[PDB]
Amino acid sequence: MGVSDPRKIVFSAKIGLALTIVALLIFYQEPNPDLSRYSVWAILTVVVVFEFTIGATLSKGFNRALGTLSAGGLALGMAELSTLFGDWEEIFCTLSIFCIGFLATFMKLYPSMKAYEYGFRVFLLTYCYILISGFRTGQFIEVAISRFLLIALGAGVSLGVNMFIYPIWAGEDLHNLVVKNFMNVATSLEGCVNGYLRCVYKGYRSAVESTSQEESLMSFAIWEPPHGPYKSFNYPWKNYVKLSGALKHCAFTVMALHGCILSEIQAPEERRQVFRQELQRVGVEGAKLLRELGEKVKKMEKLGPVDLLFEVHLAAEELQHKIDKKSYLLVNSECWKTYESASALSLATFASLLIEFVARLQNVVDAFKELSQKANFKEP
Amino acid sequence: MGVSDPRKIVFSAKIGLALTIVALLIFYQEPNPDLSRYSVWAILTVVVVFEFTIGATLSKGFNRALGTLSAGGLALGMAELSTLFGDWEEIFCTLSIFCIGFLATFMKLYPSMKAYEYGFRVFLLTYCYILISGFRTGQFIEVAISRFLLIALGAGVSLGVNMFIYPIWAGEDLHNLVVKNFMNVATSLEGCVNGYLRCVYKGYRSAVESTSQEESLMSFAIWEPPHGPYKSFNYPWKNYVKLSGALKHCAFTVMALHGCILSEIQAPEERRQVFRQELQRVGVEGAKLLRELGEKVKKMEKLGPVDLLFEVHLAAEELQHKIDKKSYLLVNSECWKTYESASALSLATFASLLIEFVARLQNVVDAFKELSQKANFKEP
Ligand SMILES: CCCCCCCCCCCCCCCCCC(=O)OC[C@H](COP(=O)(O)O)OC(=O)CCCCCCCCCCCCCCCCC
Ligand SMILES: CC(C)CCC[C@@H](C)[C@H]1CC[C@H]2[C@@H]3CC=C4C[C@@H](OC(=O)CCC(=O)O)CC[C@]4(C)[C@H]3CC[C@]12C
Ligand SMILES: CC(C)CCC[C@@H](C)[C@H]1CC[C@H]2[C@@H]3CC=C4C[C@@H](OC(=O)CCC(=O)O)CC[C@]4(C)[C@H]3CC[C@]12C
Ligand SMILES: CC(C)CCC[C@@H](C)[C@H]1CC[C@H]2[C@@H]3CC=C4C[C@@H](OC(=O)CCC(=O)O)CC[C@]4(C)[C@H]3CC[C@]12C
Ligand SMILES: CC(C)CCC[C@@H](C)[C@H]1CC[C@H]2[C@@H]3CC=C4C[C@@H](OC(=O)CCC(=O)O)CC[C@]4(C)[C@H]3CC[C@]12C
Ligand SMILES: CC(C)CCC[C@@H](C)[C@H]1CC[C@H]2[C@@H]3CC=C4C[C@@H](OC(=O)CCC(=O)O)CC[C@]4(C)[C@H]3CC[C@]12C
Ligand SMILES: CC(C)CCC[C@@H](C)[C@H]1CC[C@H]2[C@@H]3CC=C4C[C@@H](OC(=O)CCC(=O)O)CC[C@]4(C)[C@H]3CC[C@]12C
């Protein structure tokens, strides 16, 4: 609330500050009777132009400006091509409204068509207003010019109070998310083993749903200038996305491992207490490796001159040896109820899932090496 | 586009129709010079009051009306308690704007606080306008009354053109979604078995993400009157949600089964070709049962006087017998590389997952029976 995210306390304040500034400006002007009654547009612009991050603000401003200008020009021209049709100037002014409304509503229901929705809305609004009002090219331009000088003040105050007072970036957000994802999967892999051997959802149910957010953060960050520890005009951000994509593949195996614990068919504790010492070592080595990788990502450091996938591999090999030398406790070998014979293969399923998780750890290391190459990570 | 969802072609048209009607109305009035320049509010209301479904429209209208009235009253009173503070009437009018902006921004960043965001926005807008304009209780009420009679026309035309011209309901949407979810999981369970035995994502990746949509549809439907095949003042809709919740539990097992096919460690075809005939029967029986349940839900019919969980159970028992009489091909029993010994337990994992899926099918039947009881399904 007040400690989970300090940024939420600075953004709001910024907003308030902007509003105050606008008010002060309107108070500094002389007693103009037409500068005080059109002040609801500056307030609307001030509260509608703010965005959390710099890249999102920049993209929204660019798109909105282009769409507003295009729609305004086309809607001003299409209400002047309509006064020369002749005597068909009262069925056309009734068919056009219907067609424009239909097109505007149609363009909004399809997610694919989302960059051109705003322009269409602006065109619909402007065209309908000009026709129903009774205005003429000369009587509408004066109103536009009169009520656009209180829109540009709000737009430039909102744009001045965001890029120079505690700027908030998106690349840092992506970096923090990646770190928290390595740490969530490391914190869940231990809890699944402990939950199986004792007689774990927040880490595998946050990494798998964090693809759309990563894509949006990357899209926002591609609209930002060089700053701080990120010095370049083409900074590799898809190499950060690829690492999370690789980690999600392992998080799926952790998902299956947790789901094993929630089945109707379960094995007895006395049969699962034979592999406790073998499972614990893998469950600790995997988490250690994941935390080491997360920390290296956080500090922006290249991998050392020592192999990092040795201890987990040795632990997996030992587990495989123990399984091979104890397989008689998993299947019924005297026939070479069904529930009794099916409750013993759960251990085999769990061990196979753990081995699959261990084997899926090379792609993460490969992605990290590639990222460190393209981003110029400092030597250890 | 034009055939995937016919409703998308009727809604838009409705919108256009509403707009046309409004235009016609404004044209029917005499040449009023103040009834034509305030016509951008009726258009804004017309395009802002439309919703796809009836329940969503009703809920939004209720919430917006209450919040608008509350905020308008409080913002009219708080700009009249401010002219009696005395000589501290110019630092208070600067501190209040900042505080109000801070509070409005704070109330928006928290998803929990979402029913009271609109009222706060309205209060902020009204208070800031009254202060910066220079208005008095008597000079603002006249403007409000003048520009609210073109807002109520748009609101009642949008509300009249939606509830009586091709009404669209949400309960039908929930019903169709449930049916398509039973059919997606039935279409994926077959493709996972065929993909494993040959030498399947749309059905298990649509059911698991359809919980928020079901909750929203249920919330919207609780705001609708009796109609058609749904005749009651308290219609059980959470009993429809519970069935999908039960089916998702099995869809997770189908997820694991599909994920088995995408592992680095795979078994040889010659070893997996021994259980083909046993796996095919279960893969067909499960889909048949799921499709039977989906069809019964679609037609609103009670279950017959014959057990529906017999064939799948018999198939699972046969698979368990075959596994018990062929287990020597899964493990190395001569020690009572690691990859060779670990590539043979994949069959055991797949069979265990399939048996778990088969066992998780009683909860779905139980939920369907309960729903048919509370919803009064017709006898077969
Ligand atoms: C923001 C409204 C505050 C409360 C207003 C009191 C109720 C008045 C009744 C009349 C209805 C007018 C308010 C309806 C607003 C439309 C809702 C909406 O879709 O907006 C998105 C968005 C609301 O979406 P939401 O966040 O999901 O609630 O913002 C708005 O509410 C209105 C945004 C318009 C402000 C732009 C003004 C800047 C000057 C130049 C404008 C040129 C473009 C004009 C086209 C703007 C299209 C909106
Ligand atoms: C002609 C150029 C060289 C100088 C002037 C450019 C302006 C015409 C542009 C710059 C930023 C634009 C604004 C960018 C963002 C918005 C908010 C935008 O917000 C919405 O569209 C509603 C909310 C939403 O859609 O999310 C409404 C128009 C507006 C004020 C734009 C109006 C036109 C502005 C002032
Ligand atoms: C309705 C008929 C009779 C007249 C034509 C309707 C126009 C209002 C449409 C047609 C083309 C549209 C434009 C098509 C291309 C663009 C560029 C487009 O580029 C982007 O996508 C910006 C970057 C991004 O955000 O992805 C921004 C909006 C805009 C100007 C659109 C605004 C609305 C326009 C002018
Ligand atoms: C080449 C140019 C023409 C492109 C950019 C034009 C825009 C700046 C236009 C498009 C729509 C115009 C707006 C259209 C509708 C209105 C509302 C209109 O509202 C009223 O009805 C005033 C009277 C009242 O509300 O009582 C006042 C002007 C204004 C804000 C206009 C301001 C200028 C806008 C944003
Ligand atoms: C006093 C009672 C007995 C009769 C009059 C009630 C009206 C004051 C209510 C009924 C419906 C209300 C409208 C309901 C829906 C909207 C759309 C609403 O949309 C938005 O809030 C912007 C878009 C969004 O937030 O999604 C803006 C106010 C408005 C027009 C409301 C204005 C107040 C209205 C007309
Ligand atoms: C800022 C300070 C100095 C003055 C008080 C601010 C008000 C504008 C707040 C305080 C209580 C708020 C109200 C609290 C309770 C409700 C009922 C609330 O009920 C619902 O939740 C409707 C059903 C739903 O959609 O869930 C609808 C909005 C409203 C009137 C809120 C509108 C905004 C209010 C009046
Ligand atoms: C007990 C009552 C007072 C509760 C309901 C009051 C609402 C109907 C009020 C709240 C805010 C009011 C609006 C406040 C701001 C405006 C914009 C204002 O815009 C102008 O600045 C007109 C001149 C111009 O735009 O050039 C015109 C009146 C209007 C729509 C008001 C219409 C009536 C509203 C919606």
Residue numbers in the entry:
A (entry chain A), B (entry chain B): 80 to 278, 298 to 434, 527 to 570
What sentences appear in the manuscript?
In plant cells, ALMTs are key plasma and vacuolar membrane-localized anion channels regulating plant responses to the environment. Among the different ion transporters and ion channels localized in the vacuolar membrane, the ion channels of the aluminum-activated malate transporter (ALMT) family play a key role for the transport of chloride and malate during stomata opening/closure. ALMTs are also involved in transporting various anion including chloride, nitrate, fumarate, tartrate, citrate, and malate. Here we report the cryo-EM structures of ALMT9 from Arabidopsis thaliana (AtALMT9), a malate-activated vacuolar anion channel, in plugged and unplugged lipid-bound states.
From the CHS-supplemented dataset 1 with no malate and dataset 2 with 10 mM malate, we unequivocally identified CHS densities in the lateral fenestrations and phospholipid (PL) densities in the pore (hereinafter called as “pore lipid”) in two classes. The only difference observed between the datasets 1 and 2 was the presence of a malate density in the pore of the dataset 2. In the CHS-supplemented datasets 1 and 2, we identified two distinct classes in the sterol mimic-bound state: “sterol 1” when one pore lipid tail of the sterol mimic (CHS) is in the fenestrations and “sterol 2” when two pore lipid tails of the sterol mimic (CHS) are in the fenestrations. Unexpectedly, we observed that the succinate head group of CHS interacted with several residues. Similarly, the succinate head group of CHS in the lower fenestrations occupied the S3 region interacting with W120, Y208, and R226. These observations indicate that phosphate groups of PL and the dicarboxylic moieties (malate and succinate head group of CHS) compete with each other for malate binding sites S0, S1, and S3. The sterol mimic-bound and pore lipid-bound classes represent plugged states in which the pore is blocked by the head groups of one or two pore lipids.
